[PDB]
UniProtKB/Swiss-Prot annotation, chain B:
UniProt keyword annotation of Nucleus present: yes
The name this protein goes by in its record: Probable proteasome subunit alpha type-7
Species assigned in the record: Saccharomyces cerevisiae (strain ATCC 204508 / S288c)
Transmembrane segments: none
Subcellular location per the Swiss-Prot or TrEMBL entry: Cytoplasm; Nucleus
Gene symbol of the encoding locus: PRE10
Family: Belongs to the peptidase T1A family.
Keywords from the named record: Acetylation, Cytoplasm, Nucleus, Proteasome
Swiss-Prot record, chain D:
UniProt keywords, alphabetically: Cytoplasm, Isopeptide bond, Nucleus, Proteasome, Ubl conjugation
Full protein name: Proteasome subunit alpha type-3
Any Pfam family: Proteasome_A_N
Keyword flag Coiled coil: no
Entries under InterPro entries matching the protein: Ntn_hydrolases_N (IPR029055), Proteasome_alpha (IPR050115), Proteasome_alpha-type (IPR023332), Proteasome_asu_N (IPR000426), Proteasome_bsu_CS (IPR016050), Proteasome_sua/b (IPR001353)
Transmembrane segments: none
Superkingdom, natural source: Eukaryota
Reported function: The proteasome degrades poly-ubiquitinated proteins in the cytoplasm and in the nucleus. It is essential for the regulated turnover of proteins and for the removal of misfolded proteins. The proteasome is a multicatalytic proteinase complex that is characterized by its ability to cleave peptides with Arg, Phe, Tyr, Leu, and Glu adjacent to the leaving group at neutral or slightly basic pH. It has an ATP-dependent proteolytic activity.
Note: Present with 17100 molecules/cell in log phase SD medium.
GO cellular component terms attached to this protein's record: cytosol; nucleus; proteasome complex; proteasome core complex, alpha-subunit complex; proteasome storage granule
Principal location class: cytoplasm
Family indicated by similarity: Belongs to the peptidase T1A family.
UniProtKB/Swiss-Prot annotation, chain E:
Lineage: Eukaryota, Fungi, Dikarya, Ascomycota, Saccharomycotina
Source organism of the structure: Saccharomyces cerevisiae (strain ATCC 204508 / S288c) (Baker's yeast)
GO terms under cellular component: cytosol; nucleus; proteasome complex; proteasome core complex, beta-subunit complex; proteasome storage granule
Function, as annotated: The proteasome degrades poly-ubiquitinated proteins in the cytoplasm and in the nucleus. It is essential for the regulated turnover of proteins and for the removal of misfolded proteins. The proteasome is a multicatalytic proteinase complex that is characterized by its ability to cleave peptides with Arg, Phe, Tyr, Leu, and Glu adjacent to the leaving group at neutral or slightly basic pH. It has an ATP-dependent proteolytic activity.
Record's protein name: Proteasome subunit beta type-2
Gene that encodes it: PUP1
Main location, first listed in the record: cytoplasm
Swiss-Prot record, chain I:
Protein name: Proteasome subunit beta type-1
Localization in the cell: Cytoplasm; Nucleus
GO cellular component, one term: proteasome storage granule
An MF annotation (GO) of this entry: endopeptidase activity
Function, as annotated: The proteasome degrades poly-ubiquitinated proteins in the cytoplasm and in the nucleus. It is essential for the regulated turnover of proteins and for the removal of misfolded proteins. The proteasome is a multicatalytic proteinase complex that is characterized by its ability to cleave peptides with Arg, Phe, Tyr, Leu, and Glu adjacent to the leaving group at neutral or slightly basic pH. It has an ATP-dependent proteolytic activity. PRE3 and PRE4 are necessary for the peptidyl-glutamyl-peptide-hydrolyzing activity. This subunit is necessary for the peptidylglutamyl-peptide hydrolyzing activity.
Active site, per annotation: 1
Family according to the record: Belongs to the peptidase T1B family.
Extra remark: The side chain of Thr-1 acts as a nucleophile, and the N-terminal amino group acts as a proton acceptor.
GO terms, biological process: proteasomal ubiquitin-independent protein catabolic process; proteasome-mediated ubiquitin-dependent protein catabolic process
Gene: PRE3
Xref: InterPro entries: Ntn_hydrolases_N, Pept_T1A_subB, Proteasome_bsu_CS, Proteasome_sua/b, Proteasome_suB-type
E.C. number(s) listed in UniProt: 3.4.25.1
Keywords: Acetylation, Cytoplasm, Hydrolase, Nucleus, Protease, Proteasome, Threonine protease, Zymogen
Uppermost EC category: hydrolase
Length: 241, 243, 229, 244, 226, 250, 195, 204, 196
């Protein structure tokens, strides 16, 4: 039964190491969510600092890949940072070679191709991570593209990842079934973040303080993460209506 | 089964058992700690005196990287040295290209990526050490702890080795009782106490205390070993607290 | 193979009873253009060694970084880095001399003439020369470039052989060095008035003097000189 | 490390057999039967396509018979993809020889070259062998018409008539019974088709299940012509020989 | 060779003469110097003719693959970056001097690039042995906010200056117009001001004028059946 | 590090089976149905856009891909394996053909190059076979229209019409009854849509079906005018609207 | 080396090659055989740079002998000459090219025809009725152009060859110390020991 | 020294009405010394003809190379290569030796078997294609050939008229070149018949 | 070419002419020699246009990748990357580069990297063929902690004289201002600076 140890086919045509890499993805017990506005793309992720000895400012699963591209990761931090460093290198090299900023979907495809190689080549293991890339692309506008250990990737109107992804997914599905549009019809990113947080609260059935969340926002020509005080302002606005 | 026989193999849980077995080697090692103070960091380690024939103060465990970073580890000592050698290469190449000494977060990732690389293949074994390291850069003091998996975070206080639970509890008290912060000289004293307290898990043999520190005011942001009078003062303070 | 671009002129040095003195001006020439006026060409290593470098400045800055790295490296896993296992002038020279000869052997030299001045652990004076060819030699007085032709004759009048060294005080030695720098300023078209001087003494340690100037110059006699015949 | 997963493709059994070669030969025994028959005035290649479909585009299809150059052709039994790798290499070898000596490559030299490549995979590299057996039909001005076969071991032999693939035991007995030395191409064509018709696992032998080729000096005067039969031409020769 | 590029209101136009020479001898009288890197990115080449053709096709090939990979229409800056980095690597030994022009989702662009890998931006550019003649015309008549018709006129006039005044240039004017939101229109032999006059005499020989030693049929057919 | 798997991961079993290839074919069997039909004046390839989530934008996932202006490809099996094969197929069409002959390869030869890549993943060291079967439709001047299937083993076969994946056995029987050598392209598209409906459970419309053709040259898709010999790509992907129009005449 | 001549007559090929080996100031040898037998019915003479001539000739000889053993078959003169040409054509773009010019005289046993090939160090091959390398052709070709017939006997070929050598001995400044003459025909290779 | 003029020789190609012609001299020399009068410079691969002037070793090498490549082409494509395709193959092959080139001046001539269109093309030693409608010249008397062709050539010549035009272009160009001559061959090429004619000319 | 960078109270300003010559022919009279390698780190280029462009592009790449990992690089760091390329490839490069940048911690900084690949931190720097003619003028007229307006005048007057005497320099005077307020581009035409 060595077909379960390396990335070769089982008699059922399955790759067990890929399947087990998907399971490692939920090891952090963190849920993430991404949604698109008119002018922006917002990504929120649960932040859990279980040890009081930790410096909470260094605990993060959101990465600034390039000026325009942000990336949230679902999975262990070592594999997350592995993917982060590579994505940064790929995005920089792309700009140097081709003279323009690497698009979010193109980066996602590139990282997906790398992941695919790990599922075919035996000496390389899959990374136990799911990568959600976000940006406001200059051609496609607000963009969410997600990659997994199988080397699969696709664009999203909105998406959720983690142990409780299904609850969040269904919650988001139901909202877009009502609105009948592919995005959050809102001008300011502040309100799109408020929407994202509100719907995560509804789906998970939990309240959040400023330190329980982590937020990334993509606008035209820049991606940035919010501070705890920026998130607090967001939480106050949610509570006041 | 057989998932634990090879590195980089995911078990049906999604676990890398070989990395988890490396942690066992770390847990078997001596206690080492790190304390982040107001303008720097303090490192301390328990050195078990296996025999009277060991020359005192000679078998130095804490290692310097560049001139501003200190590194201490628990577990397989040779693995720790190998990691520091890499760290020194990383720091040298960074300074060569960018002129400025490597920032502590930058350095942390260099170690992190290297250790993580040793969980990607079955042709290598994971590191049998947890490394506590840090120092002072342009943005101030930083303390890190790095595990066999390649996982690392920033810390207010850190501990690893056989007496880590004891040490952690002591560190947690300091964090609660000093929200404003701890001075470098206080941190040296507290580091001595915590190692002495953590020595209860290794009470069979006696030990030698080794402390180092980087502080903006006390050492000009350079890594230095605590020696002579300042070391004896910390040993006295520690001995007073256990009695 | 290259050509020097930005260059430093003479480095001069001599031994005296308790140590060594070394000096070099603060100019970085760009051919006949006196381009850079604040270049430090004496580089101390620890508290016992000063390396004086002439020739190509870009290579000087590279050597400066090698020496900086040498200090860092020596301190690694070395509890006696500031005591018995500190870098000696002899260690620093031999390392440089190895690099210089290796580089010329690859036909890619560091276009420099270097004088390592210092005091050893046992108090012995150290003064040795190495250049782009990997050629090395020692002498009671050493000088590079123009200094070899003009400073050495003057400095050799003070210390002509080994037995003159114990008879030469630091005051007499410094006086001789300072006068030589003045003579070089008179006669070397690629020199400057501003210079640095370093004294490494076995008792008082390393004294590094910056922003020194050539003074007591004779020019008055020029007023009487008319025509060319 | 990696040793754990290594099948060790290039080792002897206790009996002194090459496991992978033997198993590759087992694979080839399930491939469609190919037959070669050498006559005084030419060579015949006949081969059975494996259980086909009505929707298969036969006239553009090639799985059995391949051209190596104008003088040499091969019949394939085994993994088609493996065969094409070797076929391309053989084509290049033939052109290399032609460029070097300005003469067409002698048949045996080409056969030896390919057979040596197969041999290499059984002795070094740790890779699986090619699951392919070839029948080589060719002509040169030294030995004239020649038939060879090579198998995954890299061993090759010369033949007057030979079969590879499925039911070779039955096929070889039938060929051994009716073959004569003074035989002609038209007689050899009939023998080949009759032998396939009896050994086939299919209910009946039809044109859509066959590939057929002849190498004849039936080329106007002192030269040789290769003829890869078209579907309609295979249908005609089946009627002529009285099989359909 | 004379080659020009001219920016206008809603795009860019590129033009070139049609003479290719071997020293003082005219090899081809109707050479095509306007090359396609991609459907809407065109360039014109001066210098070593095969270096200009080869570098165009190589970058053009890679641009096409890049376009397929990214699901986006190729950009002029990409062609530019790939050309210059390729040329710089070969330290001027690939003697390709190009004017690169095109339209893409970002807008309309005009660049020049020289054999050593340096590039330049401009509203009007000229290249080749007739570049000085062309640039004289461009410097005399260029203005901001040219229309399509004005730019084609200016470009072709600049090429004509090269044709008449530069011995390295001659024959015809080729033009390609790349307008935003439109198909690039390649206008081969846009002007034809150098048709040869009828000769004074026909030089058709009587049949049997040439002395022949041997005749034979050449077998171009393959080896025959039967 | 270093790739220390320099030995074959696909080997012959005692029975003569190449296990990994058989298992790759099993993965193809589980894959969503795709089909191809050849007409007299064109080829059609089609498949279902099995959307993994309704929040996913399935237009961003292309199951039918342009390889050259006159060649297209569709698959059944593992999507990621297909995607990289498309990248390699597009490149090899240039490196081993267009950069040599100044023209795009004929369908059969591009297929041959793709087949070679898949064969090598079946024998080379430290790799598994590709878990896809490809259907490649194309046109070239001297061979006309053609349709090829490429399997994980690297074997390829030309087809008049065929299907691969989930409901291929039933689909092929359906195609056998409908196919003739006098079909026009529109008839083939009609049959394709009929055949594909049988294997589709849920929604059946232009947004859930991906369909492309190799047909007439499209000068409107060329992007430039002025060269008479350049007449545009023969590959064309049908729009969501174009599919729905033909679903009313179904 | 200096003069190498070749003449293909009715039933044989005759190769004449000078005997002198001069190293600058002195003639070190006057009996040097500037030829190698590549196969029983194929002979190659050579001239060019010192060292490279023999190194190349023996290298070719080894290769042809290897082919002969492997296949139990003698390559045709045409095949041998093509192999040799490729080696020289490969050599001319090498780091240090073989500076060697050769004449290949062979009797084709299949066609029952003598064949003479002239190949220079660039890999320039021509099949000729008679040939030479260096300045040898300048003196001899006018005589060969006049007297040569394709139906000449071996004896007549030798007589025409003597006239060529005599003209060389008259008008050439260098003393090449006569020639060694070898005949290649259906019976193989033999040396004319009195010339 | 100049590699393109050591051996000497010329090739010329012309188009006519539903036909093409390609012709060459037969001389091979070592500078002043005439070495061979039977060195043909035109070759063919199927129905595509290739003339090559320049350094003779490269002429031979390239013929063998293109025979090699067109033979593999045919085996894989299952059809004979066309003049347009072959032209690109020649260009590609020459340019791959960009910084160590074959010292040659190749000339392609033929008729496309499907369209019936006459085709000619010329190349410089690194692959730049000259696709002229009228005529292509190459060799040590290319200037002379340009002069002859430019005056003698007229479009749409019938095969037997084209023969006279190209023959006279070659002969008179060759007679003004020291390194060309010693015989000549002319190929007249139609869609499914090719005639080869050796010309009588002065032998100095 | 005439290029310079000058530190002043609020930061630093880069200045350059716009003339690019091939011999005596002006190949480009509106060249932009002020190049951006990061948001507030720019450089002036002199020497081989191919070399300085290639170098600048590589530096921009390095600083982009630096920023993604370690945040905003210092001006010193940018100069170090320039130097590394120039020094290590000195045999194959003809590049004279002035690097100017604005930090909030360090404020305006100027580094000059001449042919050899040495680095020199200066209050101001001049380079290019035209700089030779304004060593006297610049040395006499430069003051530390000038205002923005004074520094613009100093650069304008300096490059005016460099352009006047150097045939290789000319066209417009471009300037880029680097301060806490942001990045401002300035341009001055011949009719303005010739009458100074
Ligand atoms: Cl990729
Ligand atoms: Mg794997
Ligand atoms: Mg003549
Ligand atoms: Mg001026």
């Amino acid at each position: 039964g060595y077909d379960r140890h390396i990335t070769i086919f089982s008699p059922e045509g399955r790759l067990y190491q890929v399947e087990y890499a998907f399971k490692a993805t939920n090891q952090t017990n963190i849920n993430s969510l991404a949604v698109r506005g008119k002018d922006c793309t917002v990504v929120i992720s649960q932040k859990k600092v279980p040890d009081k000895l930790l410096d909470p400012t260094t605990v993060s699963y959101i990465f600034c890949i390039s000026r325009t591209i942000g990336m949230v990761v679902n999975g262990p931090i070592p594999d997350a940072r592995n993917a982060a460093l590579r994505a940064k290198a790929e995005a920089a090299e792309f700009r140097y070679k081709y003279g323009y900023d690497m698009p979010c979907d193109v980066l996602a495809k590139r990282m997906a191709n790398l992941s695919q190689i790990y599922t075919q080549r035996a000496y390389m293991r899959p990374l136990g991570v799911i990568l959600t890339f976000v940006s406001v692309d200059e051609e496609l506008g607000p963009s969410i593209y997600k990659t997994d250990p199988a080397g699969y990737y696709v664009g999203y109107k909105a998406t959720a990842t983690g142990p409780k992804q299904q609850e969040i997914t269904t919650n988001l599905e139901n909202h877009f079934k009502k609105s009948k549009i592919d995005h959050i019809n809102e001008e300011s990113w502040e309100k799109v973040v408020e929407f994202a947080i509100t719907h995560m609260i509804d789906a998970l059935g939990t309240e959040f303080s400023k330190n329980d969340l982590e937020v990334g926002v993509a606008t035209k020509d820049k991606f940035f993460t919010l501070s705890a005080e920026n998130i607090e302002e967001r939480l106050v606005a949610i509570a006041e209506q | 089964t057989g998932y634990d026989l090879s590195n980089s193999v995911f078990s049906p849980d999604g676990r890398n058992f070989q990395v988890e077995y490396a942690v066992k080697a770390v847990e078997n090692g001596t206690t080492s700690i790190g304390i982040k103070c107001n303008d720097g960091v303090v490192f301390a380690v328990e050195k078990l005196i296996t025999s009277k024939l060991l020359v005192p103060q000679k078998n130095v465990k804490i290692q310097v990287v560049d001139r501003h970073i200190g590194c201490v580890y628990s577990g397989l000592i040779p693995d720790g040295r190998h990691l520091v050698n890499r760290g020194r290469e990383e720091a040298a190449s960074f300074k060569k290209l960018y002129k400025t000494p490597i920032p502590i977060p930058a350095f942390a990732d260099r170690l992190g990526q290297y250790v993580q690389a040793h969980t990607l293949y079955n042709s290598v074994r994971p590191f049998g050490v947890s490394t506590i390291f840090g120092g002072v850069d342009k943005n101030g003091a930083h303390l890190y702890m790095l595990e066999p998996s390649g996982s690392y975070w920033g810390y207010k206080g850190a501990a690893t080795g056989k007496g880590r639970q004891s040490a952690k509890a002591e560190l947690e008290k300091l964090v609660d009782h000093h929200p404003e912060g701890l001075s470098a000289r206080e941190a040296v004293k507290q580091a001595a106490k915590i190692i002495y307290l953590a020595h209860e898990d290794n009470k069979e043999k006696d030990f030698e205390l080794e402390i180092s520190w980087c502080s903006l005011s006390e050492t000009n942001g350079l890594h230095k070993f605590v020696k002579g009078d300042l070391l004896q003062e910390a040993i006295d303070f520690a001995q007073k607290e256990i009695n | 193979t290259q050509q020097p671009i930005v260059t430093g002129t003479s480095v001069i040095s001599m031994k005296y009873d308790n140590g060594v003195i070394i000096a070099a001006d603060n100019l970085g020439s760009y051919g006949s253009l006196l381009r850079f006026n604040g270049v430090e060409r004496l580089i101390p290593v620890g508290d016992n060694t000063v390396v004086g470098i002439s020739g190509d400045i870009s290579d000087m800055q590279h050597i400066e970084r090698l020496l900086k790295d040498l200090v860092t490296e020596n301190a690694y896993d070395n509890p006696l880095a500031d005591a018995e296992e500190a870098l000696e002038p002899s260690y620093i020279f031999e390392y440089l001399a190895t690099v210089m000869y290796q580089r010329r052997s690859k036909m890619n030299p560091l276009w420099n003439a270097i004088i390592v001045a210092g005091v050893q652990s046992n108090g012995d004076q150290f003064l040795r020369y190495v250049n782009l060819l990997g050629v090395t030699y020692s002498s009671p007085t050493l000088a590079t470039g123009f200094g070899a032709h003009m400073a050495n004759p003057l400095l050799r009048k003070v210390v002509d052989r080994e037995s003159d060294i114990p008879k030469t005080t630091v005051q007499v030695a410094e006086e001789a060095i300072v006068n030589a720098m003045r003579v070089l300023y008179y006669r070397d078209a690629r020199s400057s008035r501003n210079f640095s001087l370093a004294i490494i003494d076995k008792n008082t340690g390393l004294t590094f003097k910056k922003n020194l100037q050539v003074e007591n110059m004779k020019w008055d006699f020029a007023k009487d000189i008319k025509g060319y015949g | 490390g990696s040793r754990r997963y290594d099948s060790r493709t290039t080792i002897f059994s206790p009996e002194g057999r090459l496991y992978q070669v033997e198993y590759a030969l087992e694979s080839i025994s399930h491939a469609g039967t190919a037959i070669g028959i050498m006559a005084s005035d030419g060579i015949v290649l006949a081969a059975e396509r494996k259980v086909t479909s009505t929707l298969l585009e036969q006239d553009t299809s090639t799985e059995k018979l391949y051209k190596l150059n104008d003088k040499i052709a091969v019949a394939v039994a085994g993994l088609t993809a493996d065969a094409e790798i070797l076929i391309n290499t053989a084509r290049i070898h033939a052109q290399n020889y032609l460029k070097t000596y300005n003469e067409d490559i002698p048949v045996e030299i080409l056969v030896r070259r390919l057979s040596d490549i197969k041999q290499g995979y059984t002795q070094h590299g740790g890779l699986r062998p090619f699951g392919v057996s070839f029948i080589y039909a060719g002509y040169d001005d030294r030995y004239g018409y020649q038939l060879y076969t090579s198998n995954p071991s890299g061993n090759y032999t010369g033949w007057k008539a030979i079969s590879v693939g499925a039911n070779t035991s039955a096929a070889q007995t039938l060929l051994q019974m009716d073959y004569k030395d003074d035989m002609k191409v038209d007689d050899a064509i009939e023998l080949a088709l009759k032998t396939l018709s009896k050994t086939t696992d299919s209910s009946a032998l039809t044109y859509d299940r066959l590939e057929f080729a002849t190498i004849r000096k039936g080329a106007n005067d002192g030269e040789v012509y290769q003829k890869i039969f078209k579907p309609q031409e295979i249908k005609d020769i089946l009627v002529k020989t009285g099989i359909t | 060779t004379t080659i020009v590029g001219v920016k206008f209101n809603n795009g860019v136009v590129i033009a070139a003469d049609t003479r290719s020479t071997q020293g003082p001898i005219v090899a081809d009288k109707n050479c095509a110097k306007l090359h396609r890197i991609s459907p809407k990115i065109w360039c014109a080449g001066a210098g070593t003719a095969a270096d200009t053709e080869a570098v165009t096709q190589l970058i053009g090939s890679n641009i096409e693959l890049h376009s397929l990979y990214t699901s986006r229409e190729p950009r002029v800056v990409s062609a530019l970056q790939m050309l210059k980095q390729h040329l710089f690597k070969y330290q001027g030994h690939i003697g390709a001097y190009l004017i690169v022009a095109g339209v893409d989702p970002t807008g309309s662009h005009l660049f020049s690039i020289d054999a050593h890998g340096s590039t330049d931006v401009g509203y009007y550019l000229s290249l080749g042995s007739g570049s000085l003649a062309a640039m004289a015309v461009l410097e005399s008549h260029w203005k901001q906010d040219l229309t399509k018709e004005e730019a084609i006129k200016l470009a072709s006039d600049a090429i004509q200056a090269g044709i008449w005044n530069d011995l390295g240039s001659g024959s015809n004017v080729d033009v390609c117009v790349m307008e935003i939101g439109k198909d690039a229109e390649y206008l081969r032999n846009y002007l034809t001001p150098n048709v040869r006059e009828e000769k004074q005499k026909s030089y058709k020989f009587p049949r049997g004028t040439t002395a022949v030693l041997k005749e034979s049929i050449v077998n171009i057919c393959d080896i025959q059946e039967e | 590090m270093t790739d220390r798997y320099s030995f074959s991961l696909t080997t012959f079993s005692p029975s003569g089976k190449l296990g990994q290839i058989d298992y790759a074919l099993t993965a193809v069997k589980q894959g969503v149905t795709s089909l191809g039909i050849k007409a007299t004046n064109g080829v059609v390839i089609a498949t279902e856009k099995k959307s993994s989530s309704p929040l996913a934008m399935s237009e961003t996932l292309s199951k039918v891909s342009l390889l050259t202006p006159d060649i297209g490809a569709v698959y059944s099996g593992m999507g990621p394996d297909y995607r990289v094969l498309v990248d390699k197929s597009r490149k090899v069409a240039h490196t081993s053909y267009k950069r040599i002959y100044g023209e795009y390869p004929p369908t059969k030869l591009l297929v041959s190059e793709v087949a070679k890549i898949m064969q090598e993943a079946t024998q080379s060291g430290g790799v598994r076979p590709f878990g896809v079967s490809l259907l490649i439709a194309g046109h070239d001047e001297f061979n006309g229209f053609s349709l090829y299937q490429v399997d994980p083993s690297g074997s390829y076969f030309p087809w008049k019409a065929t299907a691969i994946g989930k409901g291929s056995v039933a689909a092929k029987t359906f195609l056998e009854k409908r196919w003739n050598d006098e079909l026009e392209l529109e008839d083939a598209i009609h049959i394709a849509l009929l055949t594909l409906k049988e294997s589709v459970e849920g929604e059946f419309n232009g947004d859930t079906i991906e369909l492309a053709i190799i047909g007439d040259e499209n000068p409107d898709l060329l992007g430039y005018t002025g060269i008479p010999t350049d007449k545009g790509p023969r590959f064309r992907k049908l729009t969501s609207q174009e599919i729905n129009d033909r679903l009313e005449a179904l | 080396m200096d003069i190498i001549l070749g003449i293909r007559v009715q039933d044989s090929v005759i190769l004449a090659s000078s005997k002198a080996v001069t190293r600058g100031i002195s003639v070190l040898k006057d009996s040097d055989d500037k030829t190698r037998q590549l196969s029983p019915h194929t002979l190659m003479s050579f001239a060019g740079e010192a060292g490279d001539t023999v190194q190349f000739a023996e290298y070719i000889q080894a290769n042809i002998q290897l082919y002969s053993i492997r296949e139990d078959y003698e390559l045709s003169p045409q095949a041998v000459s093509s192999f040799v040409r490729q080696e020289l054509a490969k050599s001319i773009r090498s780091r240090r090219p073989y500076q060697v010019n050769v004449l290949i005289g062979g009797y084709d046993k299949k066609k029952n025809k003598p064949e003479l090939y002239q190949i220079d160090y660039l890999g320039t091959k021509v099949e000729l009725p008679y040939g030479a390398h260096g300045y040898s052709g300048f003196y001899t070709f006018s005589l060969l152009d006049h007297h040569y017939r394709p139906d000449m006997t071996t004896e007549e070929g030798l007589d025409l060859l003597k006239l060529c050598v005599q003209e060389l001995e008259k008008r050439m400044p260098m003393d090449f110390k006569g020639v060694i003459v070898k005949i290649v025909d259906k019976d193989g290779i033999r040396q004319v020991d009195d010339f | 020294s100049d590699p393109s003029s050591i051996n000497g020789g010329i090739v010329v190609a012309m188009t006519g009405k539903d036909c093409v012609a390609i012709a060459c001299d037969l001389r091979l020399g070592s500078q002043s010394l005439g070495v061979s009068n039977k060195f043909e410079k035109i070759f063919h691969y199927g129905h595509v003809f290739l003339g090559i002037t320049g350094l003779a070793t490269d002429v031979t090498t390239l013929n063998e190379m293109f025979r090699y490549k067109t033979n593999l082409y045919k085996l894989k494509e299952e059809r004979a290569i066309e003049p347009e395709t072959f032209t690109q193959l020649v260009s590609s092959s020459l340019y791959e030796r960009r910084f160590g080139p074959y010292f040659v001046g190749p000339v392609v001539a033929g008729i496309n078997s499907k369209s019936g269109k006459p085709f000619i093309a010329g190349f410089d030693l690194i692959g730049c294609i000259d696709e002229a409608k009228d005529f292509i010249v190459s060799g040590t008397a290319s200037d002379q050939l340009f002069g002859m062709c430019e005056s003698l050539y007229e479009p749409n010549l019938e095969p037997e008229d084209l023969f006279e035009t190209i023959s006279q272009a070659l002969l008179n160009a060759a007679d003004r070149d020291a390194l060309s001559g010693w015989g000549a061959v002319v190929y007249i090429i139609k869609k499914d018949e090719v005639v080869k004619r050796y010309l009588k000319m002065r032998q100095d | 070419t005439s290029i310079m960078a000058v530190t002043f109270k609020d930061g630093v300003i880069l200045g350059a002419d716009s003339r690019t010559t091939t011999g005596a022919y002006i190949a480009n009279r509106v060249t932009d020699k002020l190049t951006r390698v990061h948001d507030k780190i720019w450089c002036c280029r002199s020497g081989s246009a191919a070399d300085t462009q290639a170098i600048a592009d590589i530096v921009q790449y390095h600083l982009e990748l630096y920023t993604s990992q370690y945040g905003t690089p210092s001006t010193e760091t940018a100069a170090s990357v320039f130097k590394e390329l120039c020094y290590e490839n000195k045999d194959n490069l003809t590049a004279g580069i002035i690097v100017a940048g604005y930090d909030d911690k360090n404020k305006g900084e100027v580094y000059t990297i001449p042919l050899g690949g040495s680095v020199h931190k200066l209050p101001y720097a001049i380079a290019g063929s035209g700089s030779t003619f304004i060593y006297g003028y610049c040395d006499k007229n430069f003051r530390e902690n000038m205002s923005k307006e004074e520094t613009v005048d100093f650069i304008k007057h300096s490059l005016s004289q460099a352009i006047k005497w150097d045939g290789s320099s000319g066209g417009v005077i471009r300037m880029v201002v680097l301060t806490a307020a942001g990045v401002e581009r300035l341009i001055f035409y011949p009719d303005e600076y010739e009458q100074l």
